[PDB]
Task: structure prediction
Amino acid sequence: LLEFVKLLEDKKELNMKDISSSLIKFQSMKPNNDTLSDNLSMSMSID
Amino acid sequence: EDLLEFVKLLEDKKELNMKPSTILPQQDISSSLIKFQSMKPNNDTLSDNLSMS
Amino acid sequence: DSNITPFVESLSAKAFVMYSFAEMKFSQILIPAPELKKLCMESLLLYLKSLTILASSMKLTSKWWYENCTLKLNILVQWIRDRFNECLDKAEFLRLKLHTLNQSEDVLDDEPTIFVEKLIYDRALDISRNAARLEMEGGNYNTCELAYATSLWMLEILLDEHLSSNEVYDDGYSSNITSLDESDKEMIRKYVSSIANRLKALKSKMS
Amino acid sequence: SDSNITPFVESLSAKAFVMYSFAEMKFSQILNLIPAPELKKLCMESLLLYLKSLTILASSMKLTSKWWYENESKNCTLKLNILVQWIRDRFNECLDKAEFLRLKLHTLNQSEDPQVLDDPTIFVEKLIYDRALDISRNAARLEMEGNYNTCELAYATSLWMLEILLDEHLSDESDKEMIRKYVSSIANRL
Result:
């Protein structure tokens, strides 16, 4: 329990050595998300 | 053998009788919507409580 | 405590099956005046039943939360909440469309009364009837399994005391009244039995 | 990807979930008295976390779509349907909030004017790493206060987070090593 609190208290930081466009690609997926969900539901029905 | 019996049973199904209107209240679409609408804040509250925990 | 999640999963299965039925009626709306009015009513009633199942889910969870939360449960509850808001928006849209039609087209007294429990009953038995014809044509067993399970979820709604009450028949005391009679419940009980037994037989064959 | 991808989509949803909840907790601080430079930092941090959530959600859909088009069955479980609906809902939500944050950031920036656009970076990975241990440490100290189940979930959330860091589809060896070992103490505890 104390070993655990110590280790977490004792943590070292990481060493790390677009946004606009990422949002456009996501926005572009939205129709595909609907179609897919709809295709999964339609399969759930025998008829 | 069974599949055939089961299919037949289903094809032979009778429609539900239900209760006569005489022993039911009048039908009211709006009152159910109002009740559901009033649950919304309790639904949001509950979901945030679960997330925060 | 760890048992509330399976109760919520079970309700969510029921909400899902009802929601997907509502959506199948709703889709045929997105145009003769009689058929449209029938579809609009049918869809509305199915959304209102969805809402009863979803509400029941939140209440159960709500009660459990304040008396006594898994990742799964959190996810489910987000889903239930999303479906509740969606169903409610769609049902309000449909209620408003229905007011329009009952004013803008002219036999309103004469129209046969649409009961949600007849919708559920007919639909559940069609799905099982189709599953059995499929099963005998050598069709895919998983497909058949899901169909029977779907019929059973649907019919259990009608045998469940907290879910089988009809949401357009309000007490005046905020209670919904069951519209089914006892011989209906006994007939539905019989179908539940045979469908479950069909599903067990099928499971035996695929194992 | 087998006839059942449900467990995979389930694991991805848990990752998206904990990323989304972290984003949300930042977001809720945004929604009188709050300094501009702090408002800005919070806005960026929240944005990067929604974007990370969006990456994990998108990968779920990508996997499920590939599976759906390749598997000949077309047999879906109720469960997978439900999760896919939750994914879509959450993707819409995250995307709306990320847009709102992008906008608010742009607005804030137009009330300033810089001779240091030579200038600092916010690293999403550091955000995830630090928060994950703040959760576990809060729980260990809560454990010392008495709340057995809350320590479970808290603990659980910490490991999903570190796992995202080590995941190559969702994106340093000294760091990855540091992480590669970090799950274990948390897993030991929980």
